[PDB]
A paper describes a structure:
Ionotropic glutamate receptors (iGluRs) are tetrameric ligand-gated ion channels that open their pores in response to binding of the agonist glutamate. iGluRs are tetrameric ion channels that mediate the majority of excitatory neurotransmission in the central nervous system. iGluRs share a common architecture that consists of the following layers: an upper extracellular layer of amino-terminal domains (ATDs), which are involved in receptor assembly and regulation; a layer of transmembrane domains (TMDs), which form an ion-conducting channel; a layer of LBDs sandwiched between ATD and TMD layers; and a layer of intracellular domains (ICDs), which have not been structurally resolved. Each LBD comprises two polypeptide stretches (S1 and S2) that assemble into a clamshell-like structure with an agonist-binding site between the upper (D1) and lower (D2) lobes of the clamshell. Here we determine structures of a synaptic complex of AMPA-subtype iGluR and the auxiliary subunit γ2 in non-desensitizing conditions with various occupancy of the LBDs by glutamate.
Indeed, seven distinct GluA2–γ2 structures were determined on the basis of different LBD layer conformations. In all these structures, the D1 lobes of the back-to-back LBD dimers were tightly bound to each other, and each D1–D1 interface had two bound CTZ molecules represented by well-resolved densities in the cryo-EM maps. There were two types of individual LBD monomers: Glu-bound (G) and not bound (N). Indeed, Glu-bound LBDs had clamshell closure angle α values larger than 15°, whereas ligand-free clamshells had α values smaller than 7°. At 20 µM Glu, the structural ensemble included only six of the possible tetrameric arrangements—NNNN, GNNN, GNGN, GGNN, GGGN and GGGG—with NGNN, NGGN, NGNG and GGNG tetramers not present. Estimates of the minimal pore radius, Rmin, suggested that the gate region is non-conducting in the NNNN and GNNN structures, whereas it can be permeable to water and ions in the GNGN1, GNGN2, GGNN, GGGN and GGGG structures. In the two non-conducting structures, all four M3 segments were entirely α-helical, with a slightly (one helical turn) unwound M3 in subunit A of the GNNN structure. By contrast, non-continuous integral occupancy of the pore devoid of Na+ ions and water in the gate regions of the NNNN and GNNN structures confirmed that these are non-conducting. Pore hydrophobicity increased when the T617 methyl group pointed towards the pore centre, whereas the pore became larger and more hydrophilic by hiding the methyl group into the channel wall and exposing the T617 hydroxyl group into the pore. In the non-conducting state C, represented by the NNNN and GNNN structures, the M3 segments formed straight α-helices, and the methyl groups of all four T617 pointed towards the pore centre ((i) in Fig. 5a).
Residue numbers in the entry:
A (entry chain C): 748 to 797
B (entry chain A): 404 to 549, 565 to 797
C (entry chain B): 748 to 820, 1002 to 1042, 1056 to 1116
D (entry chain D): 601 to 797
E (entry chain B): 1169 to 1209
Amino acid sequence: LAVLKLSEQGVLDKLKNKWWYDKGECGAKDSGSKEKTSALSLSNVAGVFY
Amino acid sequence: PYVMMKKNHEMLEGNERYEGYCVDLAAEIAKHCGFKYKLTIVGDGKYGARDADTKIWNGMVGELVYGKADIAIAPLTITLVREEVIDFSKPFMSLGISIMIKKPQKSKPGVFSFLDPLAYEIWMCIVFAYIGVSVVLFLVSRFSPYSESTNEFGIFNSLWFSLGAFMQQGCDISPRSLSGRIVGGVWWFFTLIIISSYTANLAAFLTVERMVSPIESAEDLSKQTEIAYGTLDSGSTKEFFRRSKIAVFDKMWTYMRSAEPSVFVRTTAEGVARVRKSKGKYAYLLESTMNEYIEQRKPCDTMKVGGNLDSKGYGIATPKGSSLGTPVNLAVLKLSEQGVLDKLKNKWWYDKGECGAKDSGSKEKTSALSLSNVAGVFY
Amino acid sequence: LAVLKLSEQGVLDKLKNKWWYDKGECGAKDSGSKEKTSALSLSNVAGVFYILVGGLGLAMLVALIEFCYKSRALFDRGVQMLLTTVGAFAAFSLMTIAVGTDYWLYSRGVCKTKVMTHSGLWRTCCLEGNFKGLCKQIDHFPEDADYEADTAEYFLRAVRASSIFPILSVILLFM
Amino acid sequence: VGGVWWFFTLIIISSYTANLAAFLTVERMVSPIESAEDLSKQTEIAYGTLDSGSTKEFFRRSKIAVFDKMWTYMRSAEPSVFVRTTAEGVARVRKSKGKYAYLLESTMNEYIEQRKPCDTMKVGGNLDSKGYGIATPKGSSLGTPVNLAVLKLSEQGVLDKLKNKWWYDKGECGAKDSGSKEKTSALSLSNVAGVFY
Amino acid sequence: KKNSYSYGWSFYFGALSFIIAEMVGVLAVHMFIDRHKQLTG
Ligand SMILES: NS(=O)(=O)c1cc2c(cc1Cl)N[C@H]([C@H]1C[C@H]3C=C[C@@H]1C3)NS2(=O)=O
Ligand SMILES: NS(=O)(=O)c1cc2c(cc1Cl)N[C@H]([C@H]1C[C@H]3C=C[C@@H]1C3)NS2(=O)=O
Ligand SMILES: NS(=O)(=O)c1cc2c(cc1Cl)N[C@H]([C@H]1C[C@H]3C=C[C@@H]1C3)NS2(=O)=O
């Protein structure tokens, strides 16, 4: 009864989000979209401006 | 093409009526065994099997078991329930389940296929914008009395400046007024985008045409839901997908179960007609040597792809314990090593063929952008 | 015990990835593999035709007013030198306002020195946080073993860090 | 004349740049340079059989005009294409850079392709047909349980199961294994070296 | 990511600092035209 009580009150949600992430601080999904490099951005051709 | 009859079959009498692959195969055995063979079509007209409703054999094997048949030189696949009741020799011809698909139509580019990376609505709006710029470029440069003789831009020059600007060759005259450089400058940005889009779209056509692959395996048939596939509704091919453990054929089975157009057809020639109707959207699963002969018949628009997903064999059958079984078995091994089974194969499937084989050949035949692609520009 | 038996033998996973998938009539997994060509329609390049006709009407308009101004009818060193001076400190104002300002970039970030983040050239701060108006000024951020595996971008980060180029814009404009 | 010729060179040079962009992107494989018949025509492409074996007896005992050309060509052939062992014959292919081919059983050819140094291909189908078979003596008291068992394994798929497992999963390298990867290539000087010449 | 970086008003005023300094520069050249004209003409 205690396990079913902790899950519906989001305690198992809260204890998950705390221990895996606050003792984390590495970045998550920093790449993101694969089409971020679709537009040929300035860092690709900044040498021509140099 | 195993056993057929000629069109003058009523004119002839007996064994001379019949022609076919098994007919000559019966002829080659009697030369090596020494028996008097009489060809007989089964009166039932079915392959041998057993139905346990009355536990009675039917067809050719039924004539073998009961006593009507002395030998069954036929497309009779060597199985287990047939082997228990009647003898087989070693198989004389090898085959398996393969795929029959409508052959892709012959690639014929139009003479104006170079205009194809842009739409016809675009080339019509380029020529319309060509006229609109050149007239504006004429109206601007000769707008003022104050000068008029200094400007070299008539109409006949202004159509030429917008022509050299679009084909990017550059023209000898250039605008000198402020508003003359506006109409000249914007059209230069227009011809930068359109010509660069035309080239990159043409690179996108030639890349994908170099990437589009045929279907050359049964798993490759399974991974794509564009082309549909069906078997006989009653046959050993249908049994094979059920009795196999492999998950590729099991999902090919459940696909045939649950596809909302039913893929099963009643016989083979109904399945052949379904290949012709769907315009290259329908695949057909059947035996290989049936698949080799059908693509060699007119209208020649089917083809063999891939390979044998299983293996079977056609065998010469004798009744169980009969005396003929061993000298037939020596005759089958004698015909194979002398290349007679090689010769009788190459004759019946190809000389009664004359459809073309591997006419496409290499996929890199269209690598070099040949003259038929851009012959319209020369026109 | 039977439920735990089906999962260890894989049956609950077997009965699921069979049922949802094989009895699934359509899917992105089913249709994703095909790829065919596309000719460019007019709407792909329709804006270039819009700028073109906009460039035509703009050409005819200034051709009209340059004509009328000549028919009806700025050249002196005096007020031109004075307008240059007015343009001089204006460029000196717009750059010197810009450098000290922390509103170069609107972004997302954390400012708590260990969220509508406004970051800047010499001072990067935060806005719409837990509390507004706090600044975390950062340069030469710690990388793999003090970055030393690469040589190129450290000179490019130090030009961002020790930002001489906006300052040398100001100093040449001051001289 | 100047107007239409400009529309000519616009189409051609844009098609030249487009077709390079298709080549350098899509690395379609070399077209497999022979087949069954094409090995007989290209006489600069040598091909060798075993000096005493089943493949040697087949080409002399042939009434087909293609194979009769093949037995004629290897008869008056220099250097000698008859090999002692298969390990010598497989080695003569990899050192001759496609000029020498090898005629062998389909079972060995699929196995050599899966072994290291991985540099072979099986082109074309079988020229003849042969079969390995479980052998019992004359007058066997167990031949009939054997051949029923062989037909049982094929209907249950076991002979096909024991093959496409064994040759493939115990296959260390393969064209099927390595074919999917695709990375970029900068142009070297030898790609455009003729334009400098 | 869906990168939400946008340029604040300080960035564009430096760009407006650029274009005016390009305009003050060419007007300074235009005045350097004229001071040579009184020197020689
Ligand atoms: N060319 S073919 O496919 O008709 C074909 C098919 C076959 C041939 C020979 C030829 Cl040429 N012989 C093989 C061999 C296996 C045993 C039965 C016959 C020989 C010994 N059987 S087969 O697989 O039935
Ligand atoms: N992925 S699924 O829905 O097919 C699925 C989901 C589950 C399965 C098995 C499968 Cl196949 N078993 C687990 C069970 C195994 C042990 C851990 C949780 C229970 C007891 N329950 S679950 O986590 O609800
Ligand atoms: N493709 S294979 O080599 O795995 C393979 C080859 C063969 C198999 C089964 C398999 Cl799995 N069985 C057949 C057998 C079935 C009947 C037809 C020929 C014999 C009797 N022999 S075969 O044609 O030599």
